[PDB]
Symmetry: C2
Subunit: 229 residues, 2 copies
């Protein structure tokens, strides 16, 4: 697979493109992750931005530059063109899975108060948001999504996790549960299972309602609450 | 406000810390956004990582280094310590709002198969996830969240948005709706309102069910569907 980022700030990507566990695939000829400076496709004035027909307070991303960029990037039909949007589908795993299968992805990163509809109908294949929160630009989101998608290339049990501890045993008066140093694995497993139940009960009672509790599980919770008195 | 990132890859941040619309506040003495190299707090071996008591296949982030880092960073009580986690609360706007009010935030960025529970009980104040998708590290998430929080410092109408267009009027046979060039603002507003209704009807019927439709709105939808025949 290969990935292109058409952005006005290709520099934002230097730190991440290299120094992250991203090179696993880059050096392994699995993928080409390269940045594209969008100002190369701009027009009298080298702006990729222009006024809205009908009026409005914001500016709108022009169609021409974007179509041109897609041209030389040889985006075929069956390449994925992603627009970073607030009203886009919030990104998810089923979506990360779907994308890791395409052989080519292009991200329109710049945040504009508007996008020419012709770009949305003819070029863009997926519109994606990160969550109900509002961001200043689409480059971070594009990088975050790349991570999730790439690391899913080739190369819960319904409860919260059991608490984990490492050395030292005692630190500033904070001691690791004795059971963990006992070497008795049936007791360590049982204790972790109890902690998972209890933590879920205290912090994600919704998860408990959708967990098929065994009689022993109910007895653990029952005595736990009696211990709180 | 001030923000610290304790990470093993401070380089990932160079591109973003500067070149994004982040400098608005940095140069304006509103905030200090600086990176901290976590390997400065490491132990015989300069690892921040160590084996799990009780056994397990992954490694666990040691408590000592993290507590030390929080010490010299002068994290007071009433500073926010954030751990990037999969089971953390997915990040949201209400959370972005809450955080933009704190005067100091520290992000533990490294992804480990485990975190010593003492860090979670004594240091960490918020545990946050990005969504059900799994990421390779916590630095991108920390940067994304910073963006949403910072830009919310000081410095929907229930339907999908109306489609936007800019020059040129005709491009590759793709023409901007005539109404937008007509200069008749009551017609432009009505047309946009119709498009919002129609698009929402076709793509987010759930939003239509929670919209207080007027008689005129129902007539727009009604004739639209008759136009589809």
């Amino acid at each position: 697979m290969k990935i292109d980022y058409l952005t006005l700030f290709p520099e934002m990507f230097d730190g991440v493109l290299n120094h992250s566990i991203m090179k696993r695939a880059q050096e392994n000829n699995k993928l080409q992750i390269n940045t594209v400076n969008f100002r190369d496709y701009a027009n009298k004035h080298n702006q990729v931005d222009d006024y809205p027909y009908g009026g409005g307070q914001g500016m709108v991303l022009k169609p021409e530059p974007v179509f041109n960029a897609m041209e030389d990037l040889d985006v075929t039909e069956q390449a994925r063109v992603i627009l970073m949007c607030p009203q886009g589908e919030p990104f998810s795993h089923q979506k990360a899975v779907e994308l890791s299968k395409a052989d080519h992805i292009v991200f329109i990163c710049g945040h504009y108060e508007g996008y020419d509809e012709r770009i949305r109908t003819h070029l863009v294949t997926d519109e994606i948001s990160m969550g109900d929160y509002v961001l200043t630009g689409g480059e971070l989101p594009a990088m975050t999504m790349t991570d999730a998608i790439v690391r899913l290339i080739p190369g819960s049990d319904g409860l919260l996790e059991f608490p984990q501890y490492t050395r030292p045993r005692e630190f500033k008066g904070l001691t690791v549960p004795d059971v963990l140093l006992s070497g008795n694995h049936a007791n360590i497993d049982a204790w972790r299972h109890e902690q998972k139940l209890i933590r879920t009960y205290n912090k994600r009672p919704d998860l408990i309602e959708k967990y098929p509790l065994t009689n022993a599980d109910k007895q653990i919770l029952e005595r736990y609450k009696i211990g709180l008195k």
